[PDB]
Design a protein around this ligand. Structure first.
Ligand SMILES: [Ca+2]
Length: 223
């Protein structure tokens, strides 16, 4: 996350770290047994880390659970990043508490100008490399589709949205792929892509979760 702030420990209780010997992606806890992340976060041998703040130190609130199963969206196109969503089943259920909580699925899509919360651990610099060990946060509006498609001509589909600022400076990208975008208490987004990071007239691009709720509910119930 470039141009944000430190969330505060355990203030984003649905935030997940996906670990493969190291932190590689984010995700969101949607119930005791399931996580949603991005399809480009697919790996074998994931361990899902709940109740994290500092990913390099054991602070006491963590739950470390192996993933049993990953499901990439059938129509995921890794060239276009269209349908960039993946469901991760936990080997054992998470124990929900003050620090480890589920986030609700949307009943409807969020509108442009809606303020959202984007969290994650990743790269804080737009030029160069600096990875923070703490959970960072950004508040950013959902931009209009016009403003989104203009920035990435012929790249944006119906399953995407943009959030942040047109001027640049504040963004996520490398700043946690797979990480949540939460608006009015619902999971509206997944950190997917965005050209460079926090560049002028380059907003972030998020997987539009409200398109997927029927797929998520069906998949989780059948698996
Ligand atoms: Ca920790």
């Amino acid at each position: 996350i470039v141009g944000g702030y430190t969330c505060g420990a355990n203030t984003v209780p649905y935030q997940v770290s996906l670990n493969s010997g190291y932190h590689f992606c984010g995700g969101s806890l949607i119930n005791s047994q399931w996580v949603v992340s991005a399809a480009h976060c697919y790996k074998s041998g994931i361990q899902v880390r709940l109740g994290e703040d500092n990913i390099n130190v054991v602070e006491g609130n963590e739950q470390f659970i192996s993933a049993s199963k990953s499901i990439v969206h059938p129509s995921y196109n890794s060239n276009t990043l269209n349908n960039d969503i993946m469901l991760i089943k936990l080997k054992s259920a998470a124990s929900l508490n003050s620090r480890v909580a589920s986030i609700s699925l949307p009943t409807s899509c969020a509108s442009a100008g809606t303020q959202c919360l984007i969290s994650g651990w990743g790269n804080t610099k737009s030029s160069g490399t600096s990875y923070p060990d703490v959970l960072k946060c950004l508040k950013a509006p959902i931009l209009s589709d016009s403003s989104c498609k203009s920035a990435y001509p012929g790249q944006i589909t119906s399953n995407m949205f943009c959030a942040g600022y047109l001027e640049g400076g504040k963004d996520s990208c490398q700043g946690d792929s797979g990480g949540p975008v939460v608006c009015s208490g619902k999971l509206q987004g997944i950190v997917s892509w965005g050209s460079g990071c926090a560049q002028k007239n380059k907003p972030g691009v998020y997987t539009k979760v409200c398109n997927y709720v029927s797929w998520i509910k069906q998949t989780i119930a059948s698996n």
